[PDB]
Write a protein that binds this ligand. Structure first.
Ligand SMILES: CC(=O)O[C@H]1C(=O)[C@@]2(C)[C@H]([C@H](OC(=O)c3ccccc3)[C@]3(O)C[C@H](OC(=O)[C@H](O)[C@@H](NC(=O)c4ccccc4)c4ccccc4)C(C)=C1C3(C)C)[C@]1(OC(C)=O)CO[C@@H]1C[C@@H]2O
Ligand SMILES: Nc1nc2c(ncn2[C@@H]2O[C@H](COP(=O)(O)OP(=O)(O)OP(=O)(O)O)[C@@H](O)[C@H]2O)c(=O)[nH]1
Ligand SMILES: Nc1ncnc2c1ncn2[C@@H]1O[C@H](COP(=O)(O)OP(=O)(O)NP(=O)(O)O)[C@@H](O)[C@H]1O
Ligand SMILES: Nc1nc2c(ncn2[C@@H]2O[C@H](COP(=O)(O)OP(=O)(O)O)[C@@H](O)[C@H]2O)c(=O)[nH]1
Ligand SMILES: [Mg+2]
Ligand SMILES: [Mg+2]
Lengths: 361, 440, 429
């Protein structure tokens, strides 16, 4: 039961952002096809990083320009086809503030990302195969992590200044962790998800910071549980054995220094928490890589809240994916190396994913 | 008029300051109350010089100090002690929230509530000065205050003043002795911010002074008082040219141009050789040659480093008392011949020299002797590459596992600012093997 | 000025607290009537830490008593140093915990913790600068463990930039004094591992062995055990009350002792401790104290440092002394006994030294160690549990007050994770 699965990792550069364009920034990152190289202004050394997929979005006519409908067909479409057999899947995004992860996963209204492509193509891939034989169920929830406190986003918050009930996490002995109080809503068509995402993202705690005009101050997790009830050789009752898959799509917050992102008051108090969570989302990658060499180790999952929920996603039973977004300016050289040196770590994680099927009993 | 503003950060800085001002006040005659009888004994003069003191119309001579710290268990000992009627009540203690031995707390969170006031007091001290030469920050690598708050102040003053020396005496971390598990981090994080503003960062280690006291004074139980007194003597010898008259007088801009070849190798070592009991005061001639050779003795350094694992690159030698010049030139000739004291191919001179006519003071209840010829040396070597490498390795054994960083992130620091401060020190350690490579 | 709010939950907590106030008052010069009758002036300068000034230069401590039975409240208020507290801070109730963790966190602490937090809000909003908290309790019962864990959670939600130091009397291997110890302790560990910054693990068997061997006592009561514990509690927080050459408050120690936010359970230890007769046959110097504090027989946590590796150690000296001898001795400990420390921390020690020693001593010292031996304690609690939970030994008295089996599995899993985190650093890298 189960198979070895190298964790999938992809890298992606963003075109020069407006503020750095006003500063007249020097390009530092280059792509020799697949391999990325980073040259300093110092040019004292030249680090090189190798990955499995290397996108490019600097300018729209370079040969090799991976658009929003290219980071699907190379990264997320395998995750979609791997969740038809039954394997659990994940796709989560690392980077710094302004590196472009909330533009890749969710896109913008005219440029949609992976969530809309995934969902609408899935429903396009369901009505192409759905018959009277095997059913197709889909539920979905959408939660966030704000200052070490889980919150739901599809809970229409009304008449108070703090309609923001803090939920909690718990550990099931077999099914692993789970959130208590999580609205798990049912969907049938893409027209049902667009009204949830439309409400969820309006609830996600965004703010205005020096790095970019709309900066997320939260990690967001987006679930889809798809169970297909199959029929096959039996004695009597059919529609019994069913294969279940859990697709989690995660959009994180960013490294954010206090100088580069002018902030005080409350902005600085959630900045710390993003940083502590992403300080622990590094230990979990580093120490899981150190398992590949036989070296016995402990993965500090419980040091934070996000890496406690996404615990079966990094290791565990999940075919996972790390999209790694990095800026091309020289002002963002002391933080792009940090992103890419963790992306190269993530590729070495071997996790065992197994098709999930339970016979009626 | 020459003037220098001595700033004293942290417990170590304040205690060195206490020793320093005890020493200066004995040297001039100004008493702890602030009064100067010597203006009323003979008829007048400049008995306590306005470089390191001020004047008030009633006759209270008042120092040019600031005495910053973020825990009140130390400045409140000054307010309550012998030197209470001397200092100005604006001693810029917070009362609150020590820096917890992390850079983050003293640089961004608990160090932003007092720096806007330090600059006010320094402005008030500098606007009342006709000719300002520089600063003298006395801090300690290892803690949060003396690592972070100094870095912040030295970034604000670099903007405000800019064309002024910003020298800094520091308690360098030892290889073996330590009082914290976080000194490597703090030091690496500090140099990053002070390899760009500061202009000469003088260093000492407490292990070196322990061993000095042991071998040269017969003290087997030395405390911080006796250490800080030797530091006070170094601070008197580096300042003796501004407060006295002598033959060769080295202003504080005459070090910056003679010891810092390149703008990043500005970490000189210090030493003060005639450390002697009253016992060995007799049975010693205590001449120039004996000292000058004693100052290049490895077992008479104030930093745990071997001078023979590098090459010298500059030396400034400052004497006090009955020193004639050719007693020096004979000695520099004695040192320019010895194969052990090895200099670079690009600095043949390397022997800046100063002389002064006021001998050293000695405090009662002290562990030092009355000497008519005191000496200090400020050297610039390639030996401290190994100390910096040791700190680099201490760091690298911990940042591998990201230990203690959740206590720095907590108070305003990202995790990419540790890798950005480790690269600069590697570049420096490479700029210490770029200099010992002989030219063609 | 730095300031601490002391809370005393349960019989153990209130007794140790009373003993601690009897010690701090002796140290600062306070009579039971709150009046100052001291000799020095270094007592009043930093009296805001533990005390508050009332009317006529009378001093009232910032104690917040708490309990569910009113039996130890009256033991205090009738006691010698009990008329110094504030009657509106003797929060109590009825309907004791029954040595049930359910009763203390869900039923009879849910009905009383709001009052305690009102007193906390009042004593914390009456402060220039707060440094943290200090709760004494007892893993093994319901009042201390339950109510204190809940209080810690509510405070660490309300005051999260502040310390929550906790002084805990853990259960002992050989003998039990309460029959449901493992469950209560496991739940309290589930609550404290996630909501503290420094925990000090005390065990009564270790104190018994101290009192029998070192102090050569024949009839040692609990007042003696608390006279030992009060001492080190005093010493953790003396560089906030007295001056010195190296000063180390609570946050410094938490930064220099906790490498990772979970491994903040420490073996405490005291210094000079000697037989009443055999003190003239001994010297009073730093080496004597360094070899008295780094020993197995002078700890309190019932755990052998020789069966582990010290991740950290901290040493708070009190007395006029040299720091050469301090640094040299701590280095000698790091060098000789190298196999009892960690490689990837180059210096595994912290040294704090102060100037004013205790009432009739010239040299005291206080040891706070973080070692990989503590897991054994937890290991035992993860074994007894497994024998009681695999058959549901006394579990219907926990379900019957609003609890579920999931809350036991979680705690077990987390305590075992803590053991594994202490264990991976027990090898040679
Ligand atoms: C001639 C002399 O010096 O008497 C000493 C003494 O000889 C010994 C026996 C004391 C004695 O301590 C004990 O007997 C003891 C009994 C049970 C549990 C713990 C201790 C002493 O009682 C303890 C007491 O220690 C103190 O005075 C401290 O202030 C101590 N006192 C209290 O806590 C205290 C408690 C209640 C009421 C009044 C004071 C203290 C320790 C830490 C922090 C603050 C205070 C002193 C001097 C002694 C005696 C009296 C024999 C020793 O203990 C301490 C804590 O220092 C035992 O070893 C030390 C020093 C000596 O060996
Ligand atoms: N020479 C000398 N060194 C000292 C003295 N006091 C402390 N140090 C050294 O300074 C190091 C850091 O401690 P501190 O300087 O007191 O820390 P700080 O700068 O005051 O910052 P805080 O931690 O916030 O108090 C210690 O590790 C000691 O080695 C002193 O009196 N003399
Ligand atoms: N590949 C791209 N092409 C064009 N524009 C992009 C691209 N990637 C990012 N951007 C723009 O960059 C801006 C910042 O993107 P955003 O996704 O908000 O970064 P971020 O990581 O979400 N900030 P934060 O959430 O605080 O980390 C957006 O307005 C995007 O339009
Ligand atoms: N040191 C000390 N320990 C005590 C005392 N009373 C009880 N204990 C310990 O505390 C545990 C029981 O805690 P208990 O006081 O009953 O908690 P509570 O009933 O919920 O308040 C046992 O393991 C005892 O060893 C005391 O006075 N001193
Ligand atoms: Mg975002
Ligand atoms: Mg201090």
């Amino acid at each position: 039961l189960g198979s070895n699965s190298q964790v999938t990792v992809a890298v992606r550069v963003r075109p020069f952002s407006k503020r750095e364009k006003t500063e007249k920034a020097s390009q530092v990152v280059f792509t020799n096809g697949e391999e990325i190289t980073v040259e300093h202004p110092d040019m004292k050394q030249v680090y090189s990083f190798i990955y499995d997929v290397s996108f490019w979005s600097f300018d729209e006519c370079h040969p090799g320009y991976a658009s929003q409908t290219t980071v699907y067909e190379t990264l997320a479409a395998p995750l979609l086809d791997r969740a038809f057999e039954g394997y659990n899947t994940c796709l989560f995004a690392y980077g710094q503030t302004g590196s472009g992860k909330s533009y890749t996963m969710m896109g913008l209204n005219e440029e949609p990302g992976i969530i809309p492509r995934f969902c609408e193509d899935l429903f396009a891939q369901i009505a192409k195969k759905q018959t009277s034989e095997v059913s197709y169920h889909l539920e979905m929830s959408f939660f966030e992590v704000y200052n070490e406190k889980i919150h739901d986003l599809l809970v229409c918050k009304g008449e108070n200044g703090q309609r923001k009930q803090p939920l909690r996490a718990r550990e099931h002995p077999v099914s692993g962790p789970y959130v208590e109080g999580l609205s798990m809503n049912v969907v049938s068509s893409y027209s049902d998800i667009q009204s949830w995402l439309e409400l969820g993202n309006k609830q996600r705690a965004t703010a205005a910071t020096g790095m970019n005009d709309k900066s997320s101050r939260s990690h967001s997790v987006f679930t889809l549980v798809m169970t297909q009830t199959k029929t096959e050789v039996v004695e009597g009752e059919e529609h019994d054995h069913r294969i279940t898959s859990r697709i989690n799509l995660v959009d994180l917050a960013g490294s954010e220094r206090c100088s580069t992102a002018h902030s005080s008051g409350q902005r600085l108090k959630e900045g710390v928490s993003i940083n502590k969570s992403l300080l622990t989302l590094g230990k979990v990658i580093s120490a899981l890589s150190e398992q590949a060499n036989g070296k016995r180790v402990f993965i500090p999952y419980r040091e934070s809240t996000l890496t406690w929920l996404l615990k079966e996603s990094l290791g565990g039973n999940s075919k996972t994916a790390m999209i790694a977004t990095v800026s091309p300016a020289a002002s963002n050289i002391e933080e792009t190396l940090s992103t890419l040196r963790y992306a190269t770590q993530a590729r070495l994680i071997v996790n065992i994913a197994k098709v999930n099927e339970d016979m009626n009993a | 008029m020459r003037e220098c503003i001595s700033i004293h950060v942290g417990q170590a800085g304040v205690q060195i300051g206490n020793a320093c001002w005890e020493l200066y006040c004995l040297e001039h005659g100004i008493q702890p109350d602030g009064q100067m009888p010597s203006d009323k004994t003979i008829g007048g003069g400049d008995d306590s010089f306005n470089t390191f003191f001020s004047e008030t119309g009633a006759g209270k001579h008042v120092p040019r100090a600031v005495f910053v710290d973020l825990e009140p268990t130390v400045i409140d000992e000054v307010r309550t002690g012998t030197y209470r009627q001397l200092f100005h009540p604006e001693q810029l203690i917070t009362g609150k929230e020590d820096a917890a031995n992390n850079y983050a707390r003293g640089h961004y969170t608990i160090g932003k509530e007092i720096i806007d006031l330090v600059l006010d007091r320094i402005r008030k001290l500098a606007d009342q000065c006709t000719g300002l030469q520089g600063f003298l920050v006395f801090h300690s690598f290892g803690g949060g205050t003396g690592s972070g708050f100094t870095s912040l102040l030295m970034e604000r003053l670099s903007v405000d003043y800019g064309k002024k020396s910003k020298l800094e005496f520091s308690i360098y971390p030892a290889p073996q002795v330590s009082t914290a598990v976080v000194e490597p981090y703090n030091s690496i994080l500090t140099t990053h911010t002070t390899l760009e503003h500061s202009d000469c960062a003088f260093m000492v280690d407490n292990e070196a002074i322990y061993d000095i006291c042991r071998r040269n004074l017969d003290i087997e139980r030395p405390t911080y008082t006796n250490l800080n007194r030797l530091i006070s003597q170094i601070v008197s010898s580096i300042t003796a040219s501004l407060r006295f008259d002598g033959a060769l007088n080295v202003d504080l801009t005459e070090f910056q141009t003679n010891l810092v070849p390149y703008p990043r190798i500005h970490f000189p070592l210090a030493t003060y050789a005639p450390v002697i009991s009253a016992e060995k005061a007799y049975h010693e001639q205590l001449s120039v040659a004996e000292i000058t050779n004693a100052c290049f003795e490895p077992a008479n350094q104030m930093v745990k480093c071997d001078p023979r694992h590098g090459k010298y690159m500059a030396c400034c030698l400052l004497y006090r008392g009955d020193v004639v010049p050719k007693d020096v030139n004979a000695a520099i000739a004695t040192i320019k011949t010895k194969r052990s004291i090895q200099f670079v191919d690009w600095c043949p001179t390397g022997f800046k020299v100063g002389i002064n006519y006021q001998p050293p003071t000695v405090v009662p209840g002290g562990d030092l002797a009355k000497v008519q010829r005191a000496v200090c040396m400020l050297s610039n070597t390639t030996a401290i590459a190994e100390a910096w490498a040791r700190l680099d390795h201490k760091f690298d054994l911990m940042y591998a596992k990201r230990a203690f960083v959740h206590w720095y992130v907590g108070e305003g620091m990202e995790e990419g600012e540790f890798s950005e401060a480790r690269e600069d020190m590697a570049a420096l350690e490479k700029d210490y093997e770029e200099v010992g490579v002989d030219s063609v | 000025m730095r300031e601490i709010v002391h809370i005393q939950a349960g019989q153990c907590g209130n007794q140790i607290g009373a003993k601690f106030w009897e010690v701090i008052s002796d140290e600062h010069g306070i009579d039971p009537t709150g009046s100052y009758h001291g000799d020095s002036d270094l007592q009043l300068e930093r009296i805001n830490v533990y005390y508050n000034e009332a009317t006529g230069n009378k001093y009232v401590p910032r104690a917040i008593l708490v309990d569910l039975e009113p039996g130890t409240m009256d033991s205090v208020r009738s006691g010698p140093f009990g008329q110094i507290f504030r009657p509106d801070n003797f929060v109590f109730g009825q309907s004791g915990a029954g040595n049930n963790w359910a009763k203390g966190h869900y039923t009879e602490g849910a009905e009383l913790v709001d009052s305690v937090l009102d007193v906390v809000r009042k004593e914390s909003e009456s402060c220039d600068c707060l440094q943290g908290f200090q709760l004494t309790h007892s893993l093994g019962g319901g009042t201390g463990s339950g109510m204190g864990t809940l209080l810690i959670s509510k405070i660490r939600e309300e005051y999260p930039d502040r310390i929550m130091n906790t002084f805990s009397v853990m259960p002992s291997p050989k003998v039990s004094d309460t029959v449901v110890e493992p469950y209560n302790a496991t739940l309290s560990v589930h609550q404290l591992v996630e909501n503290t910054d420094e925990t000090y693990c005390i065990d009564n068997e270790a104190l018994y062995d101290i009192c029998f061997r070192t102090l050569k006592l024949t009839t040692p009561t609990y007042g003696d055990l608390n006279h030992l514990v009060s001492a080190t509690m005093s010493g953790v927080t003396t560089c906030l009350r007295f001056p010195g050459q190296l000063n180390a408050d609570l946050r410094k120690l938490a930064v220099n002792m906790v490498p990772f936010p979970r491994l903040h359970f420490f073996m405490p230890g005291f210094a000079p401790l000697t037989s009443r007769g055999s003190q003239q046959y001994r010297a009073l110097t730093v080496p004597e104290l360094t070899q008295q504090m780094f020993d197995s027989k002078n700890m309190m946590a019932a755990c052998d440092p020789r069966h582990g590796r010290y991740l950290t150690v901290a040493a708070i000296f009190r007395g006029r002394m040299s720091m050469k001898e301090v640094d040299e001795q701590m280095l000698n400990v790091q060098n000789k006994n190298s196999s009892y420390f960690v490689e990837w921390i180059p210096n595994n020690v912290k040294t704090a030294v102060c100037d004013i020693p205790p009432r009739g001593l010239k040299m005291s010292a206080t040891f706070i160690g973080n070692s990989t031996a503590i897991q054994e304690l937890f290991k035992r609690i993860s074994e007894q549990f497994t024998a009681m939970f695999r058959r549901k030994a006394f579990l219907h008295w926990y379900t019957g007050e609003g609890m579920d089996e999931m809350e036991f599995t979680e705690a077990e899993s987390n305590m075992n994770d803590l053991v594994s985190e202490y264990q991976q650093y027990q090898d040679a890298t």
